[PDB]
Design a protein around this ligand. Structure first.
Ligand SMILES: COc1cc(-c2cncc(-c3ccc(C4CCN(C)CC4)cc3)c2C)cc(OC)c1OC
Ligand SMILES: COc1cc(-c2cncc(-c3ccc(C4CCN(C)CC4)cc3)c2C)cc(OC)c1OC
Ligand SMILES: COc1cc(-c2cncc(-c3ccc(C4CCN(C)CC4)cc3)c2C)cc(OC)c1OC
Length: 285
């Protein structure tokens, strides 16, 4: 048999400290190709080890196609190949796009769905998985209006790289997280989910009003905030993102404000579960 391997790289759609993402083509069809820096090799190894353990398949998880390691003269080349989502990341999308009630709920319920799928152990199935770097740049917008969760390079299974500091829960910033305890990692993801819910909700129009896109804590920390900057805001002062008055005129945003509050308790065990968040979102509107 012929094994047509060649992928054509067509367009760079992302470049960062730790690698690049390309739109590519395989057999006339778009794929996404993440090329890792050797500095972030462990993220390729961890995502590859996870998919060699359990082949996740879910409409709200970025679709795996391949992991490739290629020997070069004096280096190793590491690629991850996935489905390609031409609308780009939720972070990208929220910059110019505003939302209505239906599109806002569809986005956040799709994210909750993907996250609950990661978190749940299924017997016979999948181990429970915590993401550990959930944020709007790690969520892609699909053409059908649902999103999918990307980047399992920091993920942990239950049967170097740390999370993005802006999205870190208070127990991560004050180093009290119970590291031997899998439920602790799920509760870190729930905190981060609440921040993503805030980012999205701001862009939902009500009574002709919308907020501009801002990242969580934009008004209290610098760009590329330090670990200490974050700890002082989140742990010492116990600040949370602002809920604008205009949300309390809209039943959807009133319900979403309540939800995001229940993701942000200082006590990790008080936070909602992903399954409970899904149930609450199905009862809104
Ligand atoms: C090695 O590397 C890459 C390979 C491919 C690729 C290309 N054509 C065909 C295949 C194929 C799939 C599956 C089977 C099955 C058939 C049934 N039988 C009982 C078990 C085996 C055979 C062949 C693949 C996997 C694409 C790649 O990238 C897009 C590759 O690079 C990462
Ligand atoms: C990696 O990704 C892609 C792969 C392929 C692809 C190419 N050749 C052969 C295959 C294949 C054939 C047959 C079996 C099975 C069938 C049932 N049973 C008897 C076990 C053996 C498995 C695999 C595939 C899946 C196509 C893709 O897209 C159209 C891929 O996605 C980009
Ligand atoms: C977060 O993580 C990963 C993401 C992806 C991924 C998959 N589909 C699409 C994208 C993308 C496409 C296009 C744009 C822009 C460029 C064109 N236009 C001007 C606006 C839109 C942005 C983003 C990406 C980045 C793949 C990954 O691995 C292969 C990722 O890592 C796991």
């Amino acid at each position: 048999r012929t094994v047509a391997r060649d992928i054509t790289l067509l367009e760079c759609v992302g470049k960062g400290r730790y690698g690049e993402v390309w739109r590519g083509s395989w057999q006339g069809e778009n794929v996404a190709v993440k090329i890792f820096s050797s500095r972030d090799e462990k993220s390729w190894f961890r995502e590859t080890e996870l998919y060699n353990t359990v082949m996740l398949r879910h409409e709200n998880i970025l679709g795996f196609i391949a992991s490739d390691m290629t020997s070069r003269h004096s280096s190793t080349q590491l690629w991850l190949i996935t489905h390609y989502h031409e609308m780009g990341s939720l972070y990208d999308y929220l910059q110019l796009t505003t939302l209505d009630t239906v599109s806002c709920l569809r986005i956040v319920l799709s994210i909750a769905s993907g996250l609950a799928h990661l978190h749940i152990e299924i017997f016979g199935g999948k181990p429970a998985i915590a993401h550990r770097d959930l944020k709007s740049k790690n969520i892609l917008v699909k053409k059908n209006g649902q999103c999918c969760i990307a980047d399992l390079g920091l993920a942990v299974m239950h049967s170097p790289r740390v999370g993005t500091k802006r999205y870190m829960a208070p127990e991560v910033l004050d180093e009290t997280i119970q590291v031997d305890c899998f439920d602790s990692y799920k509760r870190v993801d729930i905190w981060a989910f609440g921040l993503v819910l805030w980012e999205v909700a701001r862009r939902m129009v009500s009574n002709g009003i919308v907020e501009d896109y801002k990242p969580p804590f934009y008004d209290v920390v610098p760009n590329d905030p330090s670990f200490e900057d974050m700890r002082k805001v989140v742990c010492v002062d116990q600040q949370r993102p602002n809920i604008p008055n205009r949300w309390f005129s809209d039943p959807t945003l009133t319900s979403l404000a309540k939800l995001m509050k229940e993701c942000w308790y200082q006590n990790p065990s008080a936070r909602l579960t992903a399954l409970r968040i899904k149930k609450t979102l199905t009862k809104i509107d």
